[PDB]
Amino acid sequence: ATFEIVNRCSYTVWAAASKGDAALDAGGRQLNSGESWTINVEPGTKGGKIWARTDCYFDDSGSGICKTGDCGGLLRCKRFGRPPTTLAEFSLNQYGKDYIDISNIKGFNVPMDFSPTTRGCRGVRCAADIVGQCPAKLKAPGGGCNDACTVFQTSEYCCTTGKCGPTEYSRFFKRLCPDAFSYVLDKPTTVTCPGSSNYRVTFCPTA
């Protein structure tokens, strides 16, 4: 499957792509404002994620740091990134269908649209200014808007036992972005696409 990753932000981002225990394609790349990077994700990839990283520094070996979404200091991510990270999430060729969604469960750093480039389903978007509107207690000094689980580490926010409800903090993400997961047990906003669809992830789709 092809994923065209497009940075429409006015700032550089370092895109990342991983399934948690391995990189997807090269795993990461710099995207200056307006740049597009097309990756190939193996069919059957379960639990894949794409995200943006901001304010990165990398040396000639591809080692360094990002203020948001750092994945063990690598340019080419092999693991998931440090929150806050808005997440494009997908499981491909799962009993003949693909499943896509956007999640704020690990916080928000950059607005995103995640849409198919092929027929048969709609895209999902979380493009509101969650960083600007972020509640004081969730603001990440390093940048972005943390989820409540990252900040407070409680069973209720982290949904440890599978017995959590919405919270004042999850409702904030849900109000700004109704089409993204706001907490682990949120009413799903997962879209079913035909198996083997192709996609585009656009950072800053509106500005």
Side-chain angles (χ1 to χ4, degrees):
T2 62
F3 284 72
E4 190 180 59
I5 304 169
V6 179
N7 180 20
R8 189 172 296 146
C9 306
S10 59
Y11 48 88
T12 300
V13 303
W14 285 259
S18 171
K19 65 182 188 64
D21 59 354
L24 297 173
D25 196 283
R29 213 203 79 175
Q30 185 171 321
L31 272 70
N32 288 156
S33 179
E35 291 193 329
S36 300
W37 174 43
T38 301
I39 66 168
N40 286 279
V41 173
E42 193 178 37
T45 289
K46 174 76 202 175
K49 302 190 197 299
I50 287 160
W51 66 105
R53 300 172 284 174
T54 61
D55 304 317
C56 305
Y57 290 97
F58 295 110
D59 63 19
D60 60 348
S61 72
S63 278
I65 188 173
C66 302
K67 289 208 185 173
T68 67
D70 195 69
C71 61
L74 301 177
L75 167 66
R76 296 163 90 260
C77 298
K78 277 101 202 163
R79 296 259 155 201
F80 295 139
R82 190 171 187 274
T85 52
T86 319
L87 298 167
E89 304 185 310
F90 45 93
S91 292
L92 313 180
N93 312 102
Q94 301 296 304
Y95 306 95
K97 295 290 178 173
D98 291 355
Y99 295 91
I100 67 167
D101 68 80
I102 290 170
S103 173
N104 289 136
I105 290 169
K106 292 286 168 178
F108 177 104
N109 60 339
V110 176
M112 172 191 278
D113 177 275
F114 178 20
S115 291
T117 53
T118 55
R119 306 194 77 104
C121 55
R122 67 168 186 102
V124 291
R125 182 177 283 204
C126 173
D129 180 21
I130 285 180
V131 177
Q133 302 291 7
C134 191
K137 285 183 169 180
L138 299 184
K139 290 179 184 275
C145 189
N146 288 309
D147 61 284
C149 171
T150 292
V151 178
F152 299 103
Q153 299 280 279
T154 68
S155 295
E156 194 66 12
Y157 296 138
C158 301
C159 209
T160 307
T161 58
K163 179 204 78 206
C164 67
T167 66
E168 192 163 313
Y169 297 123
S170 72
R171 287 186 192 96
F172 157 75
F173 288 95
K174 195 68 164 184
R175 176 169 63 83
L176 278 269
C177 284
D179 206 33
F181 279 87
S182 62
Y183 73 106
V184 174
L185 295 181
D186 204 350
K187 178 187 183 73
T189 46
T190 307
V191 170
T192 301
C193 289
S196 295
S197 293
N198 296 319
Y199 303 91
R200 177 180 290 115
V201 172
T202 308
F203 302 120
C204 301
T206 62

